[PDB]
Amino acid sequence: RGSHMNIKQFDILYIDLNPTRGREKHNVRPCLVINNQMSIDGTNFVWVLPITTRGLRYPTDIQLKTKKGLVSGVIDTVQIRALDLKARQYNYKDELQDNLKNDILKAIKTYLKPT
Amino acid sequence: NIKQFDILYIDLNPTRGREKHNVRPCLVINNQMSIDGTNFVWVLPITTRGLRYPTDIQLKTKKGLVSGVIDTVQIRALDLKARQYNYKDELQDNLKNDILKAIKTYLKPTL
Numbered sequence: 001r002g003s004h005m006n007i008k009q010f011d012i013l014y015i016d017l018n019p020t021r022g023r024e025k026h027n028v029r030p031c032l033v034i035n036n037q038m039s040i041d042g043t044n045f046v047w048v049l050p051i052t053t054r055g056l057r058y059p060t061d062i063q064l065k066t067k068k069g070l071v072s073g074v075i076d077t078v079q080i081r082a083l084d085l086k087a088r089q090y091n092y093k094d095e096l097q098d099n100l101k102n103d104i105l106k107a108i109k110t111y112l113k114p115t
Numbered sequence: 116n117i118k119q120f121d122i123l124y125i126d127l128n129p130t131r132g133r134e135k136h137n138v139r140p141c142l143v144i145n146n147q148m149s150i151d152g153t154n155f156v157w158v159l160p161i162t163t164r165g166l167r168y169p170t171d172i173q174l175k176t177k178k179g180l181v182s183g184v185i186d187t188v189q190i191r192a193l194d195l196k197a198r199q200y201n202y203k204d205e206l207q208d209n210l211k212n213d214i215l216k217a218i219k220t221y222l223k224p225t226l
Contacts, residue, residue: 009224019129022197023155035221043170043188045133047221060153078153079192087132105222111157112215114119115147 004092007046007085009036010101012064012071012094015083017050025050025079030071032064032096034080034104045082049075049104062103066094077107117156117195119146120206120214122181126199127160127191135160135189138199140181142174142206144190144218155192159185159214172217176204187217 007013011033020026031048033040040046051064051073062075071094096104117123121143130136141158143150150156161174161183172185181204206214 022194024192024194024197036223036225038225039170039188039221043168045188047190078149078155080157081191082134082189084132084134087134101224108222109219111145111149112218113146114211114215115149 007033007040007090007092008095009033009040010096010104011092012051012066012096013046013048013090013092015048015088015090017081017083025052025076030073030093031083032075032104034108035082044085046085047080047082049077050079050081052076060107062100062107065097065100067097068094070094075104077104078111080108117143117150117202118205119143119150120211121202122161122176122204122206123156123158123200123202125158125193125195127193135162135186140183140203141193142185142214144214145192154194154196156195157190157192159187159218160189160191161185170217172210172214175207175210177207178204180204185214187214187221190218 030051033046035047126138140161145157
C-alpha cells in the first residue's frame, strides 16, 4: 500500500527505554504510542506505554492486539512516558487494532480523574 | 505521603535529548487511587527557563514556594521507591482542571 512515513498515534515501535530506576520498564522493547498526531508532529515526543512479555497480572494490564500480528504481549498502562524521538533510536513495527484504541484512552483517563 | 497535584522535588536522571533532567520540582497528576494502588507517580516537570512553547503552562501554587512553567509534553511515570523526592508545594485549585484538560487533549485523536 505505502510507506508509513511518520510515527502516528497507536503505532507500536521499538525503542531503548534505558536507563531507568526501580520498577520502571527497561531495555529496548516495543512501546505503544498514545499521544495524538498534532503533538507528535509538533514536538517530536511520543507518549508511550511499554509492552511486556508477561501475561495479564494487574487490572491495569491490557492484552495487545495488532494489525500485522508482528508484536505480542501485554500493555502496561501504568508506565506512561514521554520520549524524545530526536534523541532515541526507534523502529516502527506494528499498529494497535482499531477496536482497542478507545479502551486504551479510557484506561488512561481513569488514572487522571480525581479520586 | 503523596497526593495528586502535589509538587515534589525529584531527581529525573538519567535522561536523553530534550527530556528534562537533574533534580527539579515536578507536578503529580495521577489520582490517589493510582498513586496508592501502583506506587507510581505521573509527573509533569517544571522549568525556570520561561514559557517557550504552546504546550507550556505557567505554574501557580498554594504556598508560593515553587515558581516556573509546567512542561505538559514531558509526562513521566516514576517509581518513587527508587528515587529521591521531597514535597515542596501544591498546585493552585483553579489550575487543577486546566491541567487535567491539557493532558487529556494530547490523547484525543487528530485524524
